[PDB]
């Protein structure tokens, strides 16, 4: 009998879509699935999770101590929950939230955790990537508790209706107060969130300027796509860091990924190489990107992109 606790990711009273993919991973274990919602405002998220397919039990921890989801505060909450209900597995999507939290929890449980898994073969056996996605590592975990984060793009989202989980309040915990959340600066736009987007358009160093990046926003607009970036584009100031795709940025697996003026370095390929259809727009026929692109045009992006945008305005 496996019993899994999924830590819900949410911000601004909205459930992060990656928790839904994480619930799916959790169903691979054939047992009971619980979901813990900790935060300052948890009613809508909790209510919503009680309609998600695959969840038996929702646990709700509403307290002001959880403002900004500090892992110094969440970890005791999770250890208290584990003590009471003795899960075999604790997991979360391998977002920044999940990458931040789970290894601390594993430390406190004194177990070796597993990162960014792409498959569950059995309750103790997991597949993950290493060397920037260039090798598949199959790991066996004999720990009393298996603590793991899940590659969101490797598992389908659980339906947001049809669930009938129970809801119960969790153990409130005493303020640790060794960290404090001060503020945030979020990049906000009309665009879909990069990691769940069906279509991504990405620019690299070939765009030469932040002003030129508007060409990619205009193209993305016609496709209702998110816009990603290479490290070169971020470093040269073209776009904010949070739109970086790759080993050190976001992993994305859209239906369509269009790589504009991006060479295709190993570290960029780490974050998009499982995209269903890869298109390259690049003037260099030796660009490594062309060795994974389903469709490629060797041409000047300053011609191709505006053209594509005009064609797409019609049909």
């Amino acid at each position: 009998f496996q019993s899994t606790l999924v830590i819900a990711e949410h911000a601004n009273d909205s459930l992060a879509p990656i928790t839904l993919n994480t619930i799916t991973a959790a169903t691979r274990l054939g047992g009971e699935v619980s979901c813990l919602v900790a935060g300052t405002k948890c009613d809508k998220v909790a209510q919503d999770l009680c309609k998600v397919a695959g969840i038996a039990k929702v646990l709700v921890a509403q307290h002001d101590v959880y403002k900004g989801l500090l892992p110094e505060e969440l970890t005791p909450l999770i250890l208290a929950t584990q003590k009471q209900f003795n899960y075999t597995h604790i997991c979360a999507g391998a977002s920044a939230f999940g990458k931040n939290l789970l290894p601390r929890v594993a430390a406190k449980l004194e177990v070796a955790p597993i990162s960014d898994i792409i498959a569950i073969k059995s309750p103790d056996t997991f597949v993950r990537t290493i060397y920037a996605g260039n090798a598949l590592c199959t790991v066996k975990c004999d720990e009393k508790v298996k603590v793991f984060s899940v590659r969101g793009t490797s598992f389908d989202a659980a339906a947001t209706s049809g669930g009938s989980a129970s809801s119960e309040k969790a153990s409130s915990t005493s303020p640790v107060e060794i960290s404090e959340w001060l503020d945030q600066k979020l990049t906000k736009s009309d665009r879909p969130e990069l990691t769940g987007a069906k279509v991504v358009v990405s620019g690299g160093r070939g765009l030469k300027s932040g002003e030129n990046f508007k060409l990619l926003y205009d193209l993305a607009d016609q496709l209702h796509a998110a816009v990603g970036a290479s490290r070169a584009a971020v470093d040269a100031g073209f776009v904010p860091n949070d739109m970086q795709v790759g080993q050190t940025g976001k992993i994305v697996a859209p239906e369509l990924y269009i790589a504009v003026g991006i060479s295709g370095a190993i570290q960029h390929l780490a974050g998009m190489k499982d995209s269903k259809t890869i298109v390259a727009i690049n003037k260099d026929p030796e660009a490594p990107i062309f060795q994974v692109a389903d469709y490629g045009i060797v041409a000047d992006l300053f011609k191709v992109v505006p053209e594509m945008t005009e064609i797409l305005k019609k049909k």
Binding site: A106, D142, Y295, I311
Partner: protein, 252 residues
């Protein structure tokens, strides 16, 4: 203040890796190794903290086989003060993970009375992104992970971190652990004067057993394999043709 920086030796980033025929792991013998790039960023930040005269001493530590000494020598050249090599035989270095490293670091953090442990946010080989978080967890210290800015504020640290939607800012009570994002800083080049200097600097060799750290592991590599192969697709002559193709396969 005193800083401990953890630096890892890994296969160089520009290398094309080869999986062993026996499927036990990747080839590392004879392959170019260098300091993990995120570790380099952690050393540079530690050194910048010293230059701001806010840090008195920077101790660089690497866990693993003999060749880690080179990685430590590199950190020393970049401006670290002294080194500790936690020596592990090659065979057992392969079984060495974040859990083990984090236990060693936590023991050293306490032993050497450090105020801040700096690490890279991840190693480009195991891609774990675990050690800093686990180290913090064993120590019961606050963590500021994926840092892009660090500011020492008396007995407190203000850390700007990369998160999925942008950035956020936290304040951590010292002693603290911080792991460095690539945006944090641009590591310096170590000049030959600095390298020759670093040869005077000291490295202490210790064993994890000397720290009361047991290397026993309940994780185990079943196998390591190449991912599916994916090669060049098709070239199109015109943008019209590209749009036509994408429409007919139903991606536009």
């Amino acid at each position: 203040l005193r800083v401990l920086v953890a630096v890892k030796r890994v296969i160089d980033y520009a290398v094309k890796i080869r999986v062993k025929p026996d499927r036990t792991g990747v080839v590392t013998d004879g392959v170019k190794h260098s300091m993990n790039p995120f570790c380099e960023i952690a050393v540079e930040e530690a050194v910048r903290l010293k230059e701001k005269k806010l840090v008195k001493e920077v101790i660089a530590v690497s866990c693993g086989p003999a060749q880690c000494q080179e990685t430590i020598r590199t950190a020393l050249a970049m401006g670290a003060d002294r080194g500790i090599h936690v020596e592990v035989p090659p065979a057992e270095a392969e079984r060495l993970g974040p859990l083990q490293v984090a236990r060693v670091l936590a023991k050293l953090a306490e032993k050497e009375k450090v105020d801040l442990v700096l690490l890279g946010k991840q190693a480009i080989d195991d891609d774990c992104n675990q050690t800093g978080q686990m180290t913090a967890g064993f120590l019961d210290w606050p963590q500021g992970t994926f840092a892009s800015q660090v500011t020492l504020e008396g007995d407190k640290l203000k850390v700007e971190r990369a998160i999925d939607g942008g950035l956020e800012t936290l304040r951590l009570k010292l002693p603290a652990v911080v792991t460095a994002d690539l945006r944090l800083n641009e590591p310096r080049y170590a000049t030959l004067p600095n390298i020759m200097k670093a040869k005077k600097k000291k490295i202490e060799v210790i064993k994890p057993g000397d720290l009361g750290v047991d290397l026993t592991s309940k994780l185990s590599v079943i196998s390591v394999e190449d991912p599916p192969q994916r090669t060049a697709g098709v070239k199109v002559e015109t943008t019209e043709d590209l749009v036509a193709k994408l429409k007919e396969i139903g991606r536009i």
